[model samples]
Target: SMNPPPPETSNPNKPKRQTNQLQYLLRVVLKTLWKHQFAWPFQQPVDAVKLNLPDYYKIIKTPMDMGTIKKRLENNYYWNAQECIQDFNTMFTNCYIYNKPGDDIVLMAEALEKLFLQKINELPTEE
Candidate 1:
């Protein structure tokens, strides 16, 4: 009995299914970020009031975070994985800009960025 599985299983319908699976992978990546110790800083929106960063909003026009990404991801707001993944970088860059060099927040961003880059590479390809 040397029968093989149906080749059509992957061919007829997987283009859409492939994207669904890719979406799931991104969610997995987000969850991993959520669990990270350094994730706390980037979890919520930067509160300009509480942090006394009155000019924060003016400085960073696009402030992205895990919390916002959570909702946007659920809403399928991103056109592609690159857009969604780029938001993570956006968050890190914002941290780099708002915080001082060698600061704990900056260091955290560096480490978490490395973690995410490694994970991103481990994930399967686009297109």
Candidate 2:
């Protein structure tokens, strides 16, 4: 039998908005970020041993990355726009929290944060 079931179209769980264009927004944002040379520092998790910083191993707490953010994005880690914003914010915050402004890490992070905020504003409320 090729045809079997009838439609059960009405249900109590109709809370979702049409997110057709929104999904494309996130992928475009990720690609735009990676296009910047300043994004290099955030591309992967940092190893304290590789950088020879003892405090970073203990104080950094969460190691953030463009890599993991993307990995997470693909794995249902972010179900909403705010979730994506929080992850991006945490990465930049950790850079300042664990490192001094005197270092290049902080400098680089500041650069990316500006770029991040600008791109982030494009995601919600577009035509």
Candidate 3:
């Protein structure tokens, strides 16, 4: 019998995985809030339950577009903040569905809402 073909490898020349706009913005907003020492509305150490594996993975991974997000936030791009809020809420809701009483996920969701709203309020209306 002929030997099996060699296992295929990822193409190095292929474009790298592009960051999702909403995900990028969410990271930036969260980082910004942390940098500014914004108080979170909910307690730390949330007792979130395990649900969607993909979302859980996303929650654990570090964002790649943090620099870009920092510049956008610094430049007063409220649009990104708006998008972040919407996207984060969706994410939060999805995760919240599986959250338990002691889950920290709810705290994180509330924190994001408070921080994003604060950031939005700081931007000028014309932006």
Q: For residues 1-127, could you state the per-residue lDDT of candidate 3 as single tens digits?
A: 1222221223455333323443444455556654543233221222223222444333532221223334434443443445435434554454456456546756765665677667656544332
State which candidate has the highest lDDT.
Answer: 1
- lDDT (tens digit, per residue) of candidate 2 on 1-127: 1221221223345333324333643567777777787888787766565667666746755556777677655554444666556767878888888887769878888877887778776665633
Ten-residue segment with the worst summed lDDT in candidate 2? 1-10
Mark the regions of model 1 whose C-alpha exceeds 4 Å error after superposition.
1-25
CA lDDT of each candidate? 0.71, 0.64, 0.42
TM-score for candidate 2, please give it. 0.73
**Candidate whose TM-score is highest:** 1
Candidate 1: 10-residue stretch with minimal lDDT: 1-10
lDDT of 2 at 114: 81
Q: Estimate each model's TM-score.
A: 0.76, 0.73, 0.36
lDDT of 1: 0.71
Q: Each candidate's root-mean-square deviation in Å?
A: 14.3, 12.5, 11.7
Q: Return whichever of 1 and 3 wins on lDDT.
A: 1
